[PDB]
Amino acid sequence: AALFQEQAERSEKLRTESYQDNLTGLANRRYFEMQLNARVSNPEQASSGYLLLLRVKDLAGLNQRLGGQRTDELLKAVGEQLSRECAKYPETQNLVTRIRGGEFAVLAPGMTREEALQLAQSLDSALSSLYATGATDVAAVASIGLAPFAHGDSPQAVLSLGDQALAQAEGQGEQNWACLDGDDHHAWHRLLDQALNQRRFELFFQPVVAAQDTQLVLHYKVLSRLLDEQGQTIPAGRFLPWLERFGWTARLDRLMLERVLEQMAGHEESLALNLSSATLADPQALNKVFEILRAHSNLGARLTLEIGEEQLPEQAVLEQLTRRLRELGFSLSLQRFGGRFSMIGNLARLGLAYLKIDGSYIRAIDQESDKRLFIEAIQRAAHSIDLPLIAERVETEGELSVIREMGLYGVQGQLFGEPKPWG
């Protein structure tokens, strides 16, 4: 659509102008902070992990002794070297940002300290190449601080740990890095291998309603809750990253799909359900899934699968996945969508039930222009292709009225019910 194509550049220009640091291409502090604030809040995204704070040694000195232009060039030079080291860790993806000239950060949710230690050294070792290069004249180049943050730690709290690490690193004339101070690594292992075998995850449901008619329910997202010794539940956030460090994620989709598939034959409502990259990465349990889908031909209409915008395979494959699905009469959509159209290309070609907007963009839309603006930009470019839009993490009576002003299709979030277990 010659139309779509204009509105999908106009929307991506508007991402970059808003959330992209122009120099390095990395996220701006604004975006970054929106993520931290928005992740801690979210039971399914939080929050064990690590924080990287890097400050470059002697900004001022560098500017005098080398002048602004060759200084700017330098931070480009590190943006890169940061990304390069942070590739190995996917969770970090999209979370590498530059706060202030000379200072950058990476949120690495669900990161092992040992991983952190290794990351710092590799990064530190890699960072020095710049000095030799002639890029900087300070040999130590930059200071590296890694703060470990527990989940349930407020973002402000999380940042504060980071400042200490950087400072700790700074007060060290031997090395340039540091990290503050499992567990337990094997307890999680055993607890999880176990619960999977024993089919011991519960099915939680969150309502998704029409934005126009709040009373009108489009579908219930099925979230996951791990059980523990006392049938207490544990939320996707805490445990998910542990499935990954262990490779058991596909195990879960497979389970959580057998359970949904049965339970749906208890009623007639419409559901929605995650589908990991790790089930798509593997071709063995991936295909399992279609077979499960094939047997239950009947419910394809009532079920809808959901990938994270980050977890996408190649548009080439995606086309394959979206199609092979439609054949089974089942629907597909995207979640944690953040306007990276350039990545999809073939979107209008896919035939998605909808896109669920990462909700990091929703919180305080009424009150925060740049967000409201960026989304208006998006609905417009997905209106054209009659691809419905759903907002996650709507909590406030206000945020809602702004979406009705925006004419999005639908809403999900604390405002319409936390996730619970109704059938």
TrEMBL record:
Named from the GO MF annotations, one term is: identical protein binding
**Alphabetical UniProt keywords:** Membrane, Nucleotide-binding, Transmembrane, Transmembrane helix
Q: Cite the GGDEF domain residue spans from the record.
A: 47-181
Question: Which interval of the chain is the signal sequence?
Answer: none
Q: Where does 3',3'-c-di-GMP bind?
A: Q206, K221, S224, R225, G237, D253, N274, Q335, R336, R393, E395, Q414
Q: Name one GO cellular component term.
A: membrane
Tell me where in this chain the EAL domain is found.
Answer: 185-423
Say yes or no: keyword ATP-binding present: no
The alphabetized list of GO BP terms reads:
signal transduction
- The protein here is known as Diguanylate cyclase/phosphodiesterase
* Species per Swiss-Prot/TrEMBL record: Pseudomonas fluorescens (strain Pf0-1)
